[PDB]
Amino acid sequence: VTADAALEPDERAAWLAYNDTAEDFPGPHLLARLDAVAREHPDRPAVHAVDGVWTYRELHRRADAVAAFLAARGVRPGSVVAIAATRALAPYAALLGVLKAGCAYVPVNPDDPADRVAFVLADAGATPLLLDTDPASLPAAPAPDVPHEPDRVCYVIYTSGSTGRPKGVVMAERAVDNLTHWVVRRHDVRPDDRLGQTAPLTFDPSVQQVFPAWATGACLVTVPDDVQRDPAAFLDWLRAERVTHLDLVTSHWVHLLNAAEARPAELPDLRWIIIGGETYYYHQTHRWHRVVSSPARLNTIYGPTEAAVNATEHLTEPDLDHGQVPIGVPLPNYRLYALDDDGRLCPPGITGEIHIAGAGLARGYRSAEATAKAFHELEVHSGRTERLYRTGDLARLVRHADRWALEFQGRVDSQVKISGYRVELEEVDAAVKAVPGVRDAAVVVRLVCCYVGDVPPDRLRSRLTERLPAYLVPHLLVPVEAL
Numbered sequence: 116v117t118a119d120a121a122l123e124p125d126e127r128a129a130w131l132a133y134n135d136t137a138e139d140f141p142g143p144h145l146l147a148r149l150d151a152v153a154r155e156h157p158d159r160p161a162v163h164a165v166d167g168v169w170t171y172r173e174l175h176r177r178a179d180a181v182a183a184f185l186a187a188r189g190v191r192p193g194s195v196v197a198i199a200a201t202r203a204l205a206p207y208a209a210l211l212g213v214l215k216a217g218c219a220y221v222p223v224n225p226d227d228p229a230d231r232v233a234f235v236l237a238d239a240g241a242t243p244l245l246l247d248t249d250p251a252s253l254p255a256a257p258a259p260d261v262p263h264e265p266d267r268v269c270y271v272i273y274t275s276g277s278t279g280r281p282k283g284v285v286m287a288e289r290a291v292d293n294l295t296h297w298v299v300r301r302h303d304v305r306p307d308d309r310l311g312q313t314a315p316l317t318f319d320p321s322v323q324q325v326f327p328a329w330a331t332g333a334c335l336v337t338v339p340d341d342v343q344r345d346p347a348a349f350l351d352w353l354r355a356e357r358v359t360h361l362d363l364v365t366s367h368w369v370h371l372l373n374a375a376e377a378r379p380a381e382l383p384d385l386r387w388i389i390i391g392g393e394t395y396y397y398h399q400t401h402r403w404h405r406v407v408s409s410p411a412r413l414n415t416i417y418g419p420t421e422a423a424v425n426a427t428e429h430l431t432e433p434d435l436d437h438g439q440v441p442i443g444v445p446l447p448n449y450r451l452y453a454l455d456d457d458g459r460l461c462p463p464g465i466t467g468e469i470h471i472a473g474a475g476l477a478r479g480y481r482s483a484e485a486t487a488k489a490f491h492e493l494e495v496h497s498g499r500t501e502r503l504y505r506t507g508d509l510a511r512l513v514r515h516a517d518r519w520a521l522e523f524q525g526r527v528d529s530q531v532k533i534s535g536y537r538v539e540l541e542e543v544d545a546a547v548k549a550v551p552g553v554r555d556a557a558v559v560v561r562l563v564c565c566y567v568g569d570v571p572p573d574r575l576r577s578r579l580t581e582r583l584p585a586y587l588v589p590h591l592l593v594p595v596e597a598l
């Protein structure tokens with residue numbers, strides 16, 4: 116009957132202890148806390164972008180203007196509004212002003228190919244009003260009278276794992292509030308802190324930096340694109356900007372480790388890197404704490420976008436030098452289960468598919484089919500029927516120090532990741548094959564491309580950036596005669 120039916124008491128007890136995660140957080144809802152910070156700290160810097168710094172007063176003023184504009188053009192609460200994700204100031208007033216309108220923002224990269232932007236507008240139900248006009252130069256205005264309704268939708272963020280099947284994750288306020296409380300409390304975020312935003316706003320780790328900043332009075336510091344590509348300049352930039360909290364995907368951090376081994380760094384202001392996405396190992400994290408002088412602790416996380424950025428966490432020990440780092444214990448009010456093909460809860464030590472429950476779950480996808488294939492109800496213990504999200508990820512429950520912990524084990528469809536983004540090998544093969552003049556193409560991750568045909572690698576470069584996002588156009592494009 117139940118998913119734990121076959122377990123012995125000791126094995127069922129391990130799972131019960133692991134998911135003993137309930138925590139009640141105080142204060143009003145998320146947006147209200149953001150407004151209280153604007154009242155308490157109007158003169159503090161709230162966002163530091165590439166074209167300037169905005170105080171909390173200016174940020175909420177500009178956001179107010181955005182929300183009044185949206186009301187003036189018939190955008191009622193519960194609508195979805197696109198915002199141009201850039202590294203400038205404008206997008207922050209856009210996304211905040213959308214939220215004050217009682218709406219949800221869908222982040223769009225304006226450099227992305229137009230065909231993919233059109234899909235996202237259509238699938239999100241999103242108006243492009245704020246893509247067509249400059250959100251920061253809208254006429255000043257008070258915010259409109261939007262009542263507070265509980266668990267409103269905050270964002271639709273797109274995950275592009277399946278080719279021709281981008282999925283729009285719909286995320287509501289309780290999940291984002293719960294995440295924000297965790298980030299602030301777990302990492303001791305304070306008004307004087309400076310939170311780096313490495314992820315663009317199209318990638319949900321930006322969420323984990325922006326709202327904990329704005330819910331505390333800390334400063335959100337967006338990491339400029341030219342700085343992120345150069346691991347050396349990035350390390351210098353973290354010191355010059357006195358960043359206290361940073362987000363990275365595992366592969367990006369490995370680059371920083373390489374750049375740190377070549378030129379060891381002092382980062383006295385850094386207290387936290389929240390890092391995750393791919394499996395990594397204690398011999399790497401030991402190497403890091405060797406060439407980096409810093410109080411920064413590494414917080415390894417795991418989580419799909421479908422469960423509000425992060426679902427598990429592990430404080431990474433700097434003494435250990437061997438073995439795989441575990442993804443750790445669930446975030447507050449999260450609950451995770453390792454299930455087999457049959458839906459039975461795996462004994463400790465046995466690899467299963469992660470299903471996620473609790474306060475972090477999306478409402479679902481915009482697509483009904485995708486929602487029905489991934490969210491489901493299961494009675495996992497006697498008397499506990501969970502709404503679950505089926506991740507596609509494998510993990511086992513292990514003993515790590517005094518605690519039960521999950522250890523990541525792979526995927527069921529094991530696709531590759533590039534700069535933290537799940538992508539299929541077969542989409543970049545079809546994209547270069549579809550360039551008229553090119554023929555066969557093989558793409559390997561070393562992202563390198565070998566293709567047959569007489570399109571010089573410059574004209575191919577130009578045709579690919581018009582078709583693919585900037586992160587899927589291969590780093591090398593080598594013309595070859597046969598495969």
Ligand SMILES: NC1=N[C@@H]([C@H](N)C(=O)O)CCN1
Nearest residue numbers: 320391392418419420424425
């Ligand atoms: N915080 C964090 N979470 C995950 C992310 N939500 C994802 O789906 O890739 C990996 C990178 N960083």
